[PDB]
Amino acid sequence: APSRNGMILKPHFHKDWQRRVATWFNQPARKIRRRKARQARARRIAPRPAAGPIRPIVRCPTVRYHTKVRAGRGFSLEELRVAGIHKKVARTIGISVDPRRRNKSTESLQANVQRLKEYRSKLVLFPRKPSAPKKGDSSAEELKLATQLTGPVMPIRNVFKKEKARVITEEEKNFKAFASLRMARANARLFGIRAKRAKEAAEQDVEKKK
Template sequence: MAPKGNNMIPNAHFHKDWQRYVKTWFTQPARKYRRHLKRLQKARAVAPRPAKGPLRPVVRCPSVRYHTKVRFGRGFSLDEIRKAGLNPSFARTIGIAVDHRRRNKSIESLQLNVQRLKEYRSKLILFPRRINKKLKKGEATEEERKLATQLQTVVMPIKKTTRKIRARKVHEAEKKFSAYTALRSARADVRLIGLRAKKAKEANENAEDLTKIPKVPKVTDKAPKAPKAGGKSGAAGKDAKGAKSPAKTGKDAKGAKPAAKPGKDAKPAAKPKEAKPAKEAKPKESKPKEP
């Protein structure tokens, strides 16, 4: 086969007596059998306890990339042990792994592992430490002990659940929904929460000040008026749009100050100037053209 990709062209030089550097794995089958014998020896030593170790909690993998996956944890937290009605030191003696460093960051994980402990406790056959003495609370009788068998697999494995979604009709709201718009609006709400709270507070404190009241867009249900029949809508529209109201000047202007009241120190107001009459334009005489 031809090489793939922009890689280095293989050009190996076997000039270093390569037979000396070859490592063989002829002992692999024997090691496999040796590991099998060790597992059997360990299972006989811990019998009738589970061969694959103690009960472990169900936890979420760390980081955003893997937090949707579930796996076994190192041990149950102290809160989970106490919520299940057990003592941490006693829990270690009945095949429950305990990790005093672990902290529960959600109620769901706490409830899940507490339920897991209670289920394990209900299925557990607890052998007494001393058979000849009187049985304590929770210890199994002789008949129950005869029914006990050693578990060769993991204690209470994780069950993978798959949800089947049925086909259905797509609603109008789902068609109009935009994930981009929803995300941008949510980010804007978080960014502007302080500014909006400040404006609302100022509006409550200064109820009479109209400038502090937040603007609300006007919504009108009126339909636009239809143009009159027979009229030139284009010319009329331009004249109407281009017409401007006469600007206020002088005393009628918006920014004009009110006149001061007469008093001792008040100066007499200046008399308004009389407007001069406009000059009449003389009509131009048109000279007759010569033939």
């Protein structure tokens, strides 16, 4: 029984909603429990990075977000192989791997290969038994100065290159951008049916040149 003027609406309370209501009074108890667990884990993996493994530059999928770079899941096998890192040694020295990632470009692959080489420059690998160092172990000067870095290890921020102020060529001042957009729209829309009409026209050229 609605009043004079006002938004008619569909409230989804026609079910029994009071029996299933999740209230958040343990929100700060949950936050304290999580940060107690985070401090306990971050001190039990004692010099290792608190954030976990390293995760690659990877680019968000869709049309809304492909200008943005995120931190992804794990380094691809192609990336690990170009960086020389064995796919089972990476998870031990602290590198996240997923086998599912493709590589369809070269710019992203070289970005991740550079990131892996930068990580292998930065990390301090302690010896396996401390009294007996080995060849692939970092030196005792920086074994003493190694510690936990907080935050994501080598954080990923979205850097935008700056293009300085050019003068404008008259080719740039005579590029017709709106007509070029609409003409590309029309060509990509009518590409197929023009192909079949060229097919039928050439076939009629066939049937009455033969």
